[PDB]
């Protein structure tokens, strides 16, 4: 869900 995901909770895993 989401673009900024990839910033919000897929950029640390």
């Known amino acids: ?3 900024w ?3 919000f909770x ?3 895993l």
């Open 5 to 7: 995901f990839s910033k």
């Open 1 to 3: 869900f989401v673009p």
């Open 10 to 12: 897929g950029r640390i």
